[PDB]
Amino acid sequence: AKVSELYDVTWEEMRDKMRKWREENSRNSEQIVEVGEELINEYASKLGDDIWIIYEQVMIAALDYGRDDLALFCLQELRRQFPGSHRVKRLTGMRFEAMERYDDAIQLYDRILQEDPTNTAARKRKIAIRKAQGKNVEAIRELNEYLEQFVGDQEAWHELAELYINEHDYAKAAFCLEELMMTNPHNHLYCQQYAEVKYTQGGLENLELSRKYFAQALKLNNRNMRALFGLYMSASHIASNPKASAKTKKDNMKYASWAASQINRAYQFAGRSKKETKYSLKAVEDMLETLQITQS
Amino acid sequence: PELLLDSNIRLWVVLPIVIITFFVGMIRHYVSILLQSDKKLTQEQVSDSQVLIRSRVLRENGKYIPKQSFLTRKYYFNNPEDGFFKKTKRKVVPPSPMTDPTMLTDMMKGNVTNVLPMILIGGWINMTFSGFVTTKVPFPLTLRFKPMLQQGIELLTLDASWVSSASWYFLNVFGLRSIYSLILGQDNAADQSRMMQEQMTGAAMAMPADTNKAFKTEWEALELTDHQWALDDVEEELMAKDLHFEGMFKKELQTSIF
Amino acid sequence: PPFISEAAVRGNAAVLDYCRTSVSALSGATAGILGLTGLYGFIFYLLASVLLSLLLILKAGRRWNKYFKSRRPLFTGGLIGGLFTYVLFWTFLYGMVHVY
Amino acid sequence: APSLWKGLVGIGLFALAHAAFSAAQHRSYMRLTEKEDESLPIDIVLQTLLAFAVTCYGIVHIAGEFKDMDATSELKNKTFDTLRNHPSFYVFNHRGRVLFRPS
Amino acid sequence: GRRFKWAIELSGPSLYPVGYLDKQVPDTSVQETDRILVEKRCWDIALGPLKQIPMNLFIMYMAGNTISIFPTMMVCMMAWRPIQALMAISATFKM
């Protein structure tokens, strides 16, 4: 397939696919380096501005994959033209961290901060160095420090939430996800994650909040089945708890039964695709019947 | 149609002038890009900008947020005991704009005096060709524009339709005004008329002229705004239909795995 | 309709203005090639703009609500600046051929 | 498809230029003869209009973008798995690195 | 409950976060409505165009009666601005 793939492509499509990969910031270092070094030996003629980003991406992938030789090969090419560039310094520091002797990388970051006071990338890389070197508490403190000094980056908020997830701190992650959702209200993914975080907390009021947040993002995309499943189980759990009112429990049963029918239709519309989908449809059917009998 | 002209004056005046103004505009745009220099930004001002953006985003998107957390945000901003905006105070520069003077200045400044450099170019071009007839404009004109239009031909019986090179280039300036953006893009800075006028998107959007006053203004704006949980209305989706998830699910089969 | 993206709106407006200026530029060349009076020329320019707007509406057809919120910019947009650039190319080839 | 439209636009522009040259020759002949205040032939005028209408059809097709107004549709396919990873924080400590180290 | 069978229960064992607050501090109720000063500001912004006429009169008298490119261009944009502001009066009227 390697020769077959290399045959039925052109350099334009390959470059466009690499640009799309950059846009989707996926983790495909193997394929990135596979298509990276191939276009560096086949075309190697024009598109300098594109090929510099390509060089950096290929070296980033090679740092992940297995190959420091190509990483240094692209590093010398990057250093040839721009003698003083802080991005290349950051990249070299990252590779140095990957190899050994983290302290000289820290010193390089310190010098970079001494030159340019406003360098978020170097501080982020130092925060990541102490995420893996020491405990996550100190890294959390420093990430909070940098975030307080900026209060600009959404990636910092999401990283803080991710690090707080491992510490079973849903109270602070709740605020993190609330802030990250406030800036982007049309992104249903953050709403779904916030609903899951609030559901994990527990409590009937938190259950209702998570249910409503599940149902809000359910109409923005109208296809995510994780949120619909979470809403159905939130309604079932509300029904289970004795501390409830008659009409609220009634409407919760209606919500759960409606979600069950939507599940049934979603799985029945997939049965005409293949011939093994009928069996999975049966399986989810027994699941829903058991849950319906138990709820009723 | 009269005044039979030579075929040598059209190939030595029209084309040269057109190319001259085209390349002058392009050169002006490129030089404007080259001369653009960055402005130094200090960390405290950056933080002030980010806090302003945060408060503005809270003002805009405040419906899809829990009431308890919204009140916690608003208290943190207001906080009558300490107050972030109340205590944090930077240096203040003495102002000078006044109500009536600035209300008038809004029009006094304007862009009134931005035509003179083009007039200089037109004057040089007209100086080069003293007695010349470039073209005629089909649009009928009044005889009171002839002094400005001809400006160098001694003719009182002739109509004002026949224009000189000065007005020819003057109309050439605005003829390609919307054509320059066609090859460059929406943000075009090749306008020959506005030479000295700086036209750009603008480095460093945030301009906290008086940090304290902006702090107080945002403090009162956040006190004025109310809270209306737009999430409380979930019953509209309750009674509905789900057919779009049937929608591209049909069109999600057709794509395989690379 | 609740949430709107400025990038798509800007792109739509840019495309609309680009076609409006190109059609106007060619309308100027046609009138300069033929050669008419001012009243007839202005009427012809208006007719060309109307034809361009009709073709632009025909281009969208269905599902136009998602593309354009309204239709006022489609009908009335770039009528003065487009005329300013059309008058140039009208007289550019008018006197080049006839007078010269 | 875009190449066909571009070629059609070019052909129409060439036809328009040829019609302009024909009209110029007609007026040059007219200046030779006294009086005879007649108009240019209607056939070349119709050719000019045909070249004008054809070139205005591809000029609209060449630049058609018409992006969707709603901001939810582009992120309707994007998965949270890709969003979970970020380009700022990348820890270079994985089992694949030591698995790919020998080879 | 035994009804759900599979139910995983997850427990949780200096104030640096600005948002996460230890004390809940509810009981916020603000009722401030000053329509008089808002009406006063809206009454005066619509008076600016009226006061923008006398200075244009002064600069028109200043141009004189010499037919030239500069005075003609000054007059051409002097009436264009009111017309261009007249083309979108409906939106600001609704506002």
Residue numbers in the entry:
A (entry chain B): 2 to 297
B (entry chain C): 4 to 261
C (entry chain F): 11 to 110
D (entry chain E): 2 to 104
E (entry chain D): 12 to 24, 41 to 122
Task: Please quote the authors directly.
The ER membrane protein complex (EMC) is a multiple-subunit complex that is highly expressed in the ER membrane and plays a central role in the biogenesis of membrane proteins. Specifically, the EMC is responsible for the post-translational insertion of low-hydrophobic transmembrane helix (TMH) of TA proteins, as well as for the co-translational insertion of the first helix of some multi-pass transmembrane proteins into the lipid bilayer. Here, we present cryo-electron microscopy structures of human EMC in apo and VDAC-bound states at resolutions of 3.47 Å and 3.32 Å, respectively.
During cryo-EM data processing we identified a second major class of particles that contains an extra β-barrel-type density adjacent to the transmembrane module of human EMC. The transmembrane region is composed of 13 transmembrane helices from six EMC complex subunits (EMC1 and EMC3-EMC7) and a β-barrel pore of VDAC1. The EMC-VDAC1 interface involves extensive interactions between one side of the VDAC1 barrel and three EMC subunits EMC3, EMC4 and EMC7, burying an exposed surface area of ~2,336 Å2. In particular, Glu73 of VDAC1 is buried inside a hydrophilic pocket formed by Lys112, Thr116 and Gln117 of EMC3. A surprising finding of the human EMC-VDAC1 complex structure is that, unlike in the apo EMC structure, the TMH of EMC7 is ordered in the complex and make close contacts with strands β7–β8 of VDAC1 via several aliphatic and aromatic residues, contributing about one-third of the interface between EMC and VDAC1. By contrast, the entire TMH2 of EMC3 is ordered in the EMC-VDAC1 complex, consisting of two helices α1 and α2 joined by a short loop. Helix α1 rotates by ~15° towards the direction to the TMHs of EMC4, and α2 traverses along the TMHs of EMC4, leading to the closure of the entrance to the hydrophilic vestibule. Taken together, we conclude that the association of VDAC1 causes a large conformational change in the EMC, which substantially reduces the cavity space and modifies the surface electrostatic property of the EMC hydrophilic vestibule. Collectively, The VDAC1-bound state of the EMC likely represents an additional function of the EMC beyond its primary role in client insertion.
